[PDB]
Ligand binder design. Structure first.
Ligand SMILES: Nc1ncnc2c1ncn2[C@@H]1O[C@H](COP(=O)(O)OP(=O)(O)O)[C@@H](O)[C@H]1O
Lengths: 555, 557
C-alpha cells in the first residue's frame, strides 16, 4: 500500500504505557493527546549514574536523487532489535513544517518502518519549532528596538548578522529592507529571513545539556558589531532569559513510537550543512539511560553528518558511539558509476563495481574514528541477484560486515539479519572512539584534516574575505572551536556533479560565518540556501480537509 | 493581606480537567489533554447537544477605559465563581492573550488576585498553540500570494494594491513598514508591505466568528488579498489556499478547557482586536458553554461603546445568541478621571468630580438599554474609596434605574462577588430580556455608521474624507454593502478624540479610511491612526526576565 495508508492501518499504544514500561514516572510525562508526550529533564538528572546503553549511529553513502533510506533503516533496525527482545529506543529529528506545503509531506521513515503519529509529526507536532521561531525573532525585535532607543551600545546596523525566521518556504523574505516609515518606526536597514530550522537557536536546542546551558549559549550569540568592530551579543542585550523561558517545554524530548510500538524520541531538527544534522543531545542521552540500545542518525552522507556527529555532538555530550551502520542501495551505487536516473532498472554489474568506490571511502572514513562499521543494503525490488552478491562480496573484500535489509517491505522481520550483525559487533568488537581533531589546532588546521582525511582533497584554498574573516575570529578568541563544513552533499568535493570518489581535487572556502551560541565555526564552499521557495504548483493548492476530518493532498 | 498574582496562581490546587470535563457531561472520547490541566474539547459535543436548550448568557462589559484600570476580566471570573458557590452550573468564556505584552510592558494574569483562570504561565505563553497556528495560516497565504507573482502572475494582481500583510505575535516596530522581494529575478517581486501583531489577523477574527471547521474554511476562501490591474478583487479562494489554512487550524478550532482558582470550569479560545475587529472570544466556545451549563459568563474588549456593541451587533447576530443580562464594571477612581481629576490626585475624595464623571457610566447604561438587555452595574471596590463616594455611586445608579453591587472579588474571590451574583440572578428571574441588534444589515454603510455614532457614541454626525468616500463606493459596488460595521476608534472616549473624557457633547466623528474583512464578513471604518503592531519600550520586560535551574521564573509578572 502507501506510506499514509500503512500509518492509518497501524494500531498505536498509548504513550503513557510506553513511558511507564521504560521506567518513566507518570509525574514526568506530559501528554499531548494520548499518543505524544514530553518527558521531563528530571529523568536524566535522577538516572545520571546508571550506565549508558549501547550507542548506534545510522549514516549512509553520498546522497543521490535515487534515494538512500537512512531513516527507514534506523527505524527498521530498531524494530528488529525490539523483536529480538532488546530494550531499545530510536532518536530522530523533527522535520520542518515547510516542505508539507510546498513539495512533500513525507513519512518519518517509510513503508513498514515509520514513526507515528505521522500527521502530527508533519504539522505543528508539540510546537517545538514555533518556540524556536518566537525565540529567534524576539531577539531580533530586541536588536531593532535597541537601535530605536538611542543605540547605547553603538551598533552599526549595516553589520548585523542576526536575521529572522519562519518555517515556510518564502523566497520573498530572503532580502528585505525593514525599519521604514519615519523616526517613529525604527531605523532603516537591510536584512532578511531564513527557514526556522536553520536558526542558530535550533542548533542550540540540539547541543544543550539542559535549560541553563541553553540559556548561557543564548547569551553568547553574536548579533552584530559596534562602529569600532567590538562584537555585540544576545547577553549584551539581556535577551537570554526571555529566550530560555520561551523554550521551557521545547527543551523536553517528545516521546512517540514505531508501527510496532517500539519507543521513539523525536527532538530537534537542524540543518546538516551550516549546522550538524543530529537530533538533540537531550534525547539521545536520555534514551541512553532508558535503554540498553539507542539507535540514532544524522543528515546527509557520513562525510558530513557522521563526521559532525562525532566531532561536534559526541565531543559535547561525552558520548562514545559503540557502532555505526552505513546504508547503501544498488540503485544509488550505479549512479555514482555514471548511470543516469532513467536507466537505473537495467542491470549493470560494471557500473556497480565502479560506484562501489563511494561506499569504500565512507567505510575507511568511519574507520578513522575507531568505530566498528556495518554496511546495510537497502533492498530494492528491481535489484538482480548478480548485483547484490557482487556488492556483498566487495564489502567483504573491503573487510566490512554487510547485511540485507528488507525493512521497507516486511518491518521488524526484514531487519533481523542486520540487527544480528549489529549485536554480533557490540558484544565482540569494543569501540575505540576518538574525535578526528583536537580543538587547540588552528581553524585552517582543522579544515585541512577534515578536507584531506575525510573528503580526500589534496588541499584547501581560501578567498581574501575568508582569510580576513578567519584572522578576525581567531583575534576575538573564537579560534579553538570545532568547525562545521558548509559544502554540497552530492559529492565528496564541493562540485555537485563530481560523483564519488573523485581524486586530484582541492576544496575552496569562500566565506566564514560564526555561531558562538551553538559554539562552532562555519566555512562555506558553495552558495548556501537558507530559505527555499515554493514550486509553480505548491502542494498547498491541492491540500484539503472535509467535514469528517479526512485530509487529502498532504501525502 | 492579598499576595501577588503569581504567588496566588501557584498556591491554588487545580483539579485534573478530565474530571471537570466529566462533571460537564463530556465523554472521554471528546477530550484531548495537553497535560493534566488543559484540554481541547471536540466540536461533536455541540453537535450532539444541538437540540438541548441554551443556558443563560451574561455579558461583562465596562465604562470608558483609562490608563487607571477598570476590572472587567477580574469581574467576569469572580462573578462566575460566586455563581458556582450559589450552586449553579456555570462556565466562563474568555480570550487568550497575545504573547507579545509579556515581553514589553507586563505579563497580565487572566484576571487577577483571587479571580484568575489557570494555569497562568501557560495561558500567557504558548498555551495550546492556537496563536501559532493563526500565524502560520496567515503567513502561508501571504507566501502563496508572493509566489503567485513570481510564477507568471496569472491572475494579474497589481503588487502595489495588496492588502494582505503578514503577522507575528511580538511587538516589533521595525516590521510595520518594509520592502520585500529584493535580490534579483530569482527572489520574488519587489514590493512595499508590513507585519501586524498576530492577534489583529483576520485569520484570528475568522477563528472567533466561525460556526465550525468547514465554515472557517469557507470564510478563508472569501478573504480578499489584493486587486487586479483592473480593480477586480483576488480572494484566497482564487489561489486555492483555503484547504491548507483550514488544515493548519484543525486543532485550533477546538476550545480549550481550563478553570478558575476555585475549579469552576472555563474556556479560553480566540483573541482578536477590539478596534479593527470585535474583541470577543470564539462563538464555538461560547455556544458549547451554553449547552453544557445553565449559566455562561463571557466578556468583550474595551468599553461598552466598542466591545458590547460589537458583541451584540456582530457575534450575537452571527450566532443567534440572545443575551439575558449584562454587567457593567466601574470604579470610583476612573469615574473621577472622567470628571477631570488627573491620575496624580485620584486618591483624594471628590464627590463633585465623581458626580460629574458618572455621566460616563450613565451613558453606557442607556446604551445597553437600546439592545433590550437588563443592565447591572458592578462597582469594583478599591481600598482608598471612601464610603461617601461609594454611597453616592449607588444613589446615582438607582436614580438611573440600574441594580448595582459592590464587588470585592479581587481580594476575596467568589465570596466577594456573591452580592453581584445574587443581583444578576434577581434580574434573570424577574426581568427577561428583549434582545435585538442595533441595526438592520440592509441599511447602507453610512446609515449603519451613523446609527452607531449617534445612538451609541452620542455624536451629532459623521464626516468622511475623499478616500473613505472612494472606498465605500468601491465596497458598495462590489456588493460588500450589506455587511455589519466594525468601528476602529479610540477606546478612551465616546468621541474619536482620546482626550475628550466623560460624556462629550456637540461633536462629530471623522472617518479617514475604510478597510474590508470579507472573510470575517464585515467593514472596518477607521477614525484615528490605528496601531496594528506595537513596539517595545525603553527598558523592555525581556531584559529583566530570567528562569533558573529550579524552574523558578522572575521578572515575568
Ligand atoms: N479591586 C481591585 N483592587 C486592586 N486591583 C484591582 C482591583 N480590580 C482590578 N484590579 C487590577 O487592576 C487591573 C484592572 O483589572 P483588570 O481585570 O486587569 O482590567 P480589565 O480586564 O478591565 O482591562 C487588573 O490587572 C487587576 O489585576
Amino acid at each position: 500500500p502507501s506510506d499514509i495508508e500503512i500509518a492509518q492501518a497501524a494500531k498505536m499504544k498509548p504513550v503513557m504505557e510506553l513511558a511507564r514500561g521504560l521506567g518513566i514516572q507518570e509525574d514526568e510525562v506530559e501528554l499531548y493527546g494520548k499518543y505524544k508526550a514530553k518527558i521531563s529533564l528530571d529523568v536524566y538528572r535522577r538516572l545520571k549514574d546508571k550506565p549508558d546503553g549501547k550507542l548506534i549511529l545510522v549514516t549512509a553513502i553520498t546522497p543521490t536523487p535515487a534515494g538512500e533510506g537512512k531513516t527507514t533503516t534506523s527505524v527498521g533496525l530498531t524494530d528488529a532489535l525490539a523483536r529480538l527482545g532488546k530494550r531499545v529506543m530510536v532518536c530522530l529529528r523533527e522535520p520542518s513544517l515547510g516542505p508539507s506545503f510546498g513539495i512533500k509531506g513525507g513519512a518519518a521513515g517509510g513503508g513498514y518502518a515509520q514513526v507515528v503519529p505521522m500527521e502530527d509529526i508533519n504539522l505543528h507536532f508539540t510546537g517545538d519549532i514555533h518556540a524556536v521561531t518566537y525565540a529567534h525573532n524576539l531577539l531580533a525585535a530586541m536588536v531593532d528596538n535597541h537601535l530605536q532607543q538611542g543605540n547605547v551600545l553603538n551598533i552599526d546596523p549595516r553589520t548585523i548578522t542576526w536575521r529572522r525566521v519562519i518555517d515556510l518556504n518564502d523566497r520573498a523574505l530572503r532580502n528585505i529592507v525593514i525599519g521604514l516609515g519615519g523616526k517613529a518606526n525604527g531605523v532603516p536597514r537591510e536584512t532578511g529571513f531564513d527557514i526556522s530550522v536553520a536558526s542558530e537557536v535550533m542548533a542550540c536546542l540540539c547541543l544543550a545539556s539542559d535549560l541553563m546551558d541553553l540559556k548561557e549559549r543564548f547569551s553568547r550569540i553574536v548579533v552584530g558589531y559596534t562602529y569600532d568592530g567590538k562584537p555585540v551579543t544576545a547577553g549584551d542585550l539581556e535577551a537570554q532569559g526571555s529566550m530560555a523561558l520561551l523554550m521551557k517545554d521545547a527543551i523536553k524530548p517528545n516521546l512517540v513510537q514505531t508501527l510496532e510500538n517500539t519507543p521513539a524520541f523525536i527532538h530537534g531538527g537542524p540543518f546538516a550543512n551550516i549546522a550538524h544534522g543530529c537530533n538533540s543531545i537531550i534525547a539521545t542521552k536520555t534514551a541512553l539511560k532508558l535503554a540498553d540500545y539507542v539507535v540514532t542518525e544524522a543528515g546527509f552522507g557520513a562525510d558530513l553528518g557522521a563526521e559532525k556527529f562525532y566531532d561536534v555532538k559526541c565531543r559535547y555530550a561525552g558520548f562514545k558511539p559503540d557502532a555505526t551502520v552505513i546504508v547503501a542501495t544498488v540503485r544509488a551505487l550505479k549512479m555514482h558509476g555514471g548511470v543516469p536516473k532513467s536507466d537505473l532498472a537495467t542491470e549493470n554489474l560494471e557500473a556497480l563495481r565502479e560506484g562501489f568506490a563511494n561506499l569504500e571511502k565512507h567505510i575507511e572514513n568511519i574507520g578513522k574514528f575507531g568505530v566498528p562499521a556495518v554496511v546495510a543494503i537497502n533492498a530494492f525490488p528491481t535489484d538482480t541477484e548478480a548485483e547484490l552478491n557482487l556488492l556483498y562480496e566487495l564489502c567483504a573484500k573491503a573487510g566490512a560486515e554487510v547485511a540485507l535489509s528488507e525493512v521497507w517491505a516486511k518491518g521488524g522481520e526484514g531487519g533481523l539479519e542486520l540487527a544480528r550483525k549489529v549485536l554480533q559487533t557490540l558484544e565482540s568488537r569494543p569501540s575505540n572512539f576518538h574525535v578526528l581533531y583536537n580543538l587547540d589546532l588552528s581553524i585552517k588546521d582543522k579544515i585541512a584534516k577534515i578536507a584531506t582525511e575525510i573528503y580526500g582533497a589534496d588541499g584547501v584554498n581560501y578567498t581574501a574575505e575568508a582569510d580576513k574573516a578567519i584572522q578576525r575570529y581567531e583575534s576575538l578568541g573564537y579560534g579553538n572551536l570545532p568547525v562545521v563544513m558548509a559544502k554540497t552533499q552530492y559529492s565528496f568535493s564541493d562540485d555537485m556533479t563530481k560523483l564519488g570518489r573523485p581524486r586530484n581535487f582541492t576544496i575552496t572556502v569562500r566565506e566564514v560565518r560564526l555561531s558562538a551560541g551553538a559554539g562552532f565555526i562555519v566555512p562555506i564552499t558553495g552558495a548556501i540556501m537558507t530559505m527555499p521557495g515554493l514550486p509553480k504548483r505548491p502542494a498547498a493548492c491541492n491540500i484539503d480537509i472535509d467535514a469528517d476530518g479526512v485530509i487529502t493532498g498532504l501525502f
